[PDB]
Amino acid sequence: LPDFHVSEPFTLGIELEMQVVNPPGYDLSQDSSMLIDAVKNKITAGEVKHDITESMLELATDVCRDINQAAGQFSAMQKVVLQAATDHHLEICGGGTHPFQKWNFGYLIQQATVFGQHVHVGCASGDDAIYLLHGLSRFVPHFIALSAASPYMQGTDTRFASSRPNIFSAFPDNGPMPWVSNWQQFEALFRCLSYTTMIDSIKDLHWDIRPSPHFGTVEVRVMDTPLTLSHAVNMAGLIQATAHWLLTERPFKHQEKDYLLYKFNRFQACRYGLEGVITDPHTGDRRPLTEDTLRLLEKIAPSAHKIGASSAIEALHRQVVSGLNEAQLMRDFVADGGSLIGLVKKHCEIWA
Amino acid sequence: PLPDFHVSEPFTLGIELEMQVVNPPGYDLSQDSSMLIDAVKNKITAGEVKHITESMLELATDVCRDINQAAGQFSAMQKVVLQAATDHHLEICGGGTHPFQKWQQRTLENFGYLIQQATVFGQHVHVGCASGDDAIYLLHGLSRFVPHFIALSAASPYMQGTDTRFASSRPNIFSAFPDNGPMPWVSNWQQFEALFRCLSYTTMIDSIKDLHWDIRPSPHFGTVEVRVMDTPLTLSHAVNMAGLIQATAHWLLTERPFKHQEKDYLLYKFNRFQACRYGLEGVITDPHTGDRRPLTEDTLRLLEKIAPSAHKIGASSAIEALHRQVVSGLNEAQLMRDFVADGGSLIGLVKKHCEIWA
Numbered sequence: 155l156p157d158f159h160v161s162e163p164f165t166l167g168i169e170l171e172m173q174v175v176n177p178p179g180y181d182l183s184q185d186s187s188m189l190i191d192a193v194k195n196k197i198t199a200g201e202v203k204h205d206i207t208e209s210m211l212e213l214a215t216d217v218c219r220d221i222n223q224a225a226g227q228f229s230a231m232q233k234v235v236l237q238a239a240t241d242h243h244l245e246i247c248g249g250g251t252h253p254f255q256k257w258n259f260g261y262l263i264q265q266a267t268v269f270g271q272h273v274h275v276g277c278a279s280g281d282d283a284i285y286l287l288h289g290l291s292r293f294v295p296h297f298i299a300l301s302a303a304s305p306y307m308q309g310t311d312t313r314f315a316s317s318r319p320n321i322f323s324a325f326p327d328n329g330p331m332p333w334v335s336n337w338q339q340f341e342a343l344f345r346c347l348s349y350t351t352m353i354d355s356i357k358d359l360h361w362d363i364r365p366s367p368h369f370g371t372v373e374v375r376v377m378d379t380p381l382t383l384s385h386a387v388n389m390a391g392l393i394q395a396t397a398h399w400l401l402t403e404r405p406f407k408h409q410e411k412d413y414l415l416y417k418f419n420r421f422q423a424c425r426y427g428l429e430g431v432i433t434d435p436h437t438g439d440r441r442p443l444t445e446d447t448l449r450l451l452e453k454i455a456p457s458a459h460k461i462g463a464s465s466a467i468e469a470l471h472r473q474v475v476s477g478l479n480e481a482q483l484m485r486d487f488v489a490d491g492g493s494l495i496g497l498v499k500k501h502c503e504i505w506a
Numbered sequence: 507p508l509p510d511f512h513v514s515e516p517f518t519l520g521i522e523l524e525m526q527v528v529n530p531p532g533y534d535l536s537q538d539s540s541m542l543i544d545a546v547k548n549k550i551t552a553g554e555v556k557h558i559t560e561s562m563l564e565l566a567t568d569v570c571r572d573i574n575q576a577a578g579q580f581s582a583m584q585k586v587v588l589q590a591a592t593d594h595h596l597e598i599c600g601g602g603t604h605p606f607q608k609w610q611q612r613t614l615e616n617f618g619y620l621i622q623q624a625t626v627f628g629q630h631v632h633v634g635c636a637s638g639d640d641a642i643y644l645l646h647g648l649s650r651f652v653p654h655f656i657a658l659s660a661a662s663p664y665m666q667g668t669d670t671r672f673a674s675s676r677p678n679i680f681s682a683f684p685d686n687g688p689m690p691w692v693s694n695w696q697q698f699e700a701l702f703r704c705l706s707y708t709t710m711i712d713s714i715k716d717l718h719w720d721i722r723p724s725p726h727f728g729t730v731e732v733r734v735m736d737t738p739l740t741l742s743h744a745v746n747m748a749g750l751i752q753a754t755a756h757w758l759l760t761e762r763p764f765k766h767q768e769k770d771y772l773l774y775k776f777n778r779f780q781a782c783r784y785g786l787e788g789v790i791t792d793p794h795t796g797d798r799r800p801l802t803e804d805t806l807r808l809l810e811k812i813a814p815s816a817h818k819i820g821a822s823s824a825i826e827a828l829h830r831q832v833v834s835g836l837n838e839a840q841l842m843r844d845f846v847a848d849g850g851s852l853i854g855l856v857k858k859h860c861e862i863w864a
Contacts, residue, residue, distance in 0.1 A: 259671075260669075262678070324681035346793050347776075349792075349796035349798070350773060350791050418684040420684070425617075433708050
């Protein structure tokens, strides 16, 4: 593995996997490679690629300093993209799963395509990356609940706020990174994992949060892709302010037992969103995520000012206080008599 | 708190087989394994026959001293069950999954669509031990061969009518639950209680029985329970898998051949996946040395180390039959695939599996 790249203070990078739908039926497209081959010169900052499926358009920012910069690169990418979409009679929308799309790892891979948002935070060293990773792992339940946007799967209400994460549960590498206390221990772990033929690079390990020594960042990849660009930017600010608070204040001394209930709390967030309950593994104390998330928001507020994300922190606070659950909001649209086709159309208009 | 760990006679055996009750002439999972059970009330001389899941019949031996006593208790329950079946026009067969069946507690609330799949069927083996520390040592020893147990028992390539491409797909059914796979690491009984105390702080678990681990300790029965295997097509195989586990348990606790450390589990999920997907053709990788070898080869090394222990406890037959299987280059999953490749239907396949069990 290469030396851990020394990145600039808390740099930021965002990747969004958007859905490409084909009107008027509004199911996922399969001919969206021509979208990239339509913006292959119409994007100055950031990057746009596509999956092997052709139903996903990935937008990525370059390395930014704050959410205002990310927001600008996304805004500029959005105009071109929307133009190309219209030019090809296609539409773009966010969300963790397409509501009705129906589909060697055999059948595990034969499930509908899903859409996630990844956020990269710069670190100065490997030991800092490891500290940042463990610190962020504590709020993964919170990051999932705040971004949950995938209640529907193949036409049925799964009851989950975010069902997308269930699609990877059978894979060996799913979930939290195995524990390591520092960068040296991480290199040994990666060395051991590399023994299998399945693992050749870190890119192959789909942990919820993973470090990158080549880019000098820690990557959070547990979130559903948001319905709007602004919410995606706010989640990124949230993660950047938490990173700043963790690394500058070092509020915790990380212990393996901090991860004991990691999967149980992760499940509660996927299944119930902010109404899920988080349990402390050391004391057994339980708290709804709405309450606990408000406490995270108040704790990282000063750090949010410092790196320019206080506006994201304030908006997330307003949303937790009022409820605003996209999962439910989708269910209400449908409960009010709207159709899944209509819901996808609504989401296309919303993203624009 | 958890019960004190019951002092069992070491190496005794308790076996459970969840059998499939199918309905001719369509051969789908039946919804009457109840009237069949009520038909065998009392008839069972030793052991027990119970359901949960109207398509499932569970055959459980009592606590046995050796595999022969076990082969005995099953053979007798089998005759009884086979006759009750005949009188109700139902049939019985093994296998980890029903090849074409499609789906129709406080678990629904929590998991929703995740548990609304097809019924899966496993063989469970309980090995008695003297204490909690011994149970922990025994569990870690057995965790090293979980890939071997799965591969040797693989018999669930089909799921809901479709070929999954796995040898044993049943072990994935619980991949979405927070407590599936290997038990979190603890080094002795004292730490295990601390582990269980932690886990029970959550809503879905108040007892050892709510845990979906591959291998689970039972302070109540005074046993270490291996629960990763698919229910085999025959009773002889079920009995032979129990003898392997018993022989390995004997080798582990008497020779104490490994010095257990958390790093031993590092590649547990990758090796577990290789077994599920390719059966004995799977490759096993050591996390320490990085050595890679197919499960066929590794299973033969296991059979060698446990031959002496098997002789003393009366399970050499199990070991020899397993050895022939390993070098036979044939596996239930491929035999099911060949059947279908040759023109057979999944329905025909189930009918054939009922004739095999009988």
